[PDB]
């Protein structure tokens, strides 16, 4: 991945807080989870 994805993997680190209705928009999964981890690419999950 020439591109380093977008969000990297800070294990042992807090996630982005929430607390706004607009910021919580469409966070409700609508499709089955799929995971993508590979050589020279940050891991990602998509639902």
């Amino acid at each position: 991945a020439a591109l380093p994805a977008t969000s990297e993997s800070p294990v042992l680190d807090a996630k982005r807080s929430f607390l706004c209705r607009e910021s919580l928009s469409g966070q409700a999964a609508g499709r089955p989870l799929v995971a993508s981890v590979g050589l020279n690419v940050p891991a990602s999950v998509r639902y």
């Binding site: 209705r21 999964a29 981890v37």
Partner: protein
């Protein structure tokens, strides 16, 4: 110019290629070897296999693989769902041959050396922790555990009791029983068919049969609730909808988009989404409801996913559910049906436009359907769905065993019987 040419190999392989003359070309080997095929004594093997790329293979060492892949500046990404893994390589169309050779070495002749796997087993914990930082991962895993009994219940990630005990022999057996020439699809975007056939004859000669057949994922209807303590309670209540690629599947997708599935205008109000409007008239606090549709080969799961505050969660579960019941007796405006069909057709076309999305769509089509249908066919199928089918849809969801998964401060979340 050119078309998605399709040719099923005598072995059982299906090669489809599309030469779009793009500057970069991608190749995806889609293997019907997801996590649904893990038995009870080898759970998590598929996860490690997903992270097992770049390990020393038979023809190329791990150092050689990494240096060759990244010196060109290419890609090696494994995308795994509950039913099908997919190795994917991406580079310029000039250096595609080396990428194909590396992909075929890592997917056809792996070694799984003892020290390599022993070192790699630590990465399972890191991957699980990173993925589970998103509560939706935990919620969906619990949902799959509490909905399906045997086959689909297996998690996409290695359970904590198996981290460190995934023997290389387990990986070898998994590959030999699932990485079969009749369960895979070598899909190429930006290449030509003869080139893809030569690499097919290059190694691509595993047992050729259909491998170890899975089991029909029986329904459970259970309820898994965990109290993790984070304020935002995520809950999800589903029922067995239908198998993918069926008329009921299209009706359930139309129903999903009628109810509302994610936002369209960034920071809008989800006015079209009936669930959002129904819930908003109740709780006046930050929430998010959306129809959750899953369509696997053997069966499916249609339900509602609600992120809500801990105190209000029950109301969010109740009113939204009532909204679906409103459709069950029949309150679907034909305007709403037409709008949902337009949203579905759009979402499909805008998912196909991306090269990666096109590759995944063609891979899934090859694995499940066995053929490829042009977007016009899918749009016509969606248009063929009638309102009566969307009304089944609602009746089937309402009257059935409901599997529910919840996470957060579950002090007020209703149970399945409530």
């Amino acid at each position: 110019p050119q078309d998605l040419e399709f040719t099923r190999l005598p072995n059982g392989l299906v090669i489809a290629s599309l030469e779009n003359y793009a500057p970069a070309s991608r190749i995806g080997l889609f293997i019907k070897a997801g996590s649904r095929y893990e038995d009870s004594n080898n759970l998590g093997t598929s996860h490690l296999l997903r992270l097992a790329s770049s390990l020393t293979t038979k023809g190329a060492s791990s150092f050689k693989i990494t240096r060759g892949i990244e010196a060109v500046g290419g890609k090696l990404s494994v995308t795994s769902t509950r039913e099908s893994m997919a190795y994917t390589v991406e580079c310029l169309r000039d250096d595609i041959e080396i990428l194909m050779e590396f992909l075929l070495n890592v997917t056809a002749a792996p070694e799984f050396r003892r020290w390599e796997v022993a070192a790699l087993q630590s990465q399972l914990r890191i991957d699980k922790a990173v993925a589970f930082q998103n509560p939706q991962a935990q919620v969906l895993e619990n949902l799959h555990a509490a909905a399906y009994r045997n086959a689909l219940a297996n998690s996409l990630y290695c359970p904590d009791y198996r981290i460190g005990k995934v023997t290389p022999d387990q990986l070898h057996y998994y590959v030999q029983n699932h990485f079969t020439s009749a369960r895979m699809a070598l899909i190429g975007l930006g290449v030509s068919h003869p080139v893809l056939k030569q690499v097919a004859e290059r190694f691509l000669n595993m047992r050729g049969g259909l491998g170890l057949s899975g089991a029909k994922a029986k329904y459970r209807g259970g309820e898994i609730r965990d109290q993790n303590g984070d304020s935002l309670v995520h809950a999800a209540l589903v029922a067995e909808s239908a198998a993918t690629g069926s008329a009921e599947a299209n009706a359930f997708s139309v129903l999903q988009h009628v109810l509302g599935a994610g936002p369209h205008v960034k920071r809008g109000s989800n006015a079209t989404s009936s669930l959002y409007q129904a819930v908003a008239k109740g709780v006046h606090q930050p929430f998010d409801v959306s129809a959750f549709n899953a369509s696997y080969s053997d069966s499916g799961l249609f339900g509602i996913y609600t992120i809500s505050q801990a105190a209000s969660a029950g109301d969010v579960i109740k009113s939204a559910y009532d909204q679906v019941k409103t459709i069950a007796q029949g309150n679907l405006s034909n305007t709403d049906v037409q709008a949902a069909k337009n949203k579905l057709k759009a979402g499909y076309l805008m998912s196909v436009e991306s090269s990666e999305g096109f590759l995944d769509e063609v891979g899934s089509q090859a694995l499940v359907a066995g053929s490829y249908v042009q977007p016009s066919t899918v749009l016509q199928q969606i248009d063929s769905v009638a309102d009566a089918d969307v009304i089944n849809a609602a009746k089937k969801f309402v009257s059935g065993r409901k599997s529910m998964a919840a996470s957060g401060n579950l002090g007020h979340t209703p149970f399945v019987d409530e």
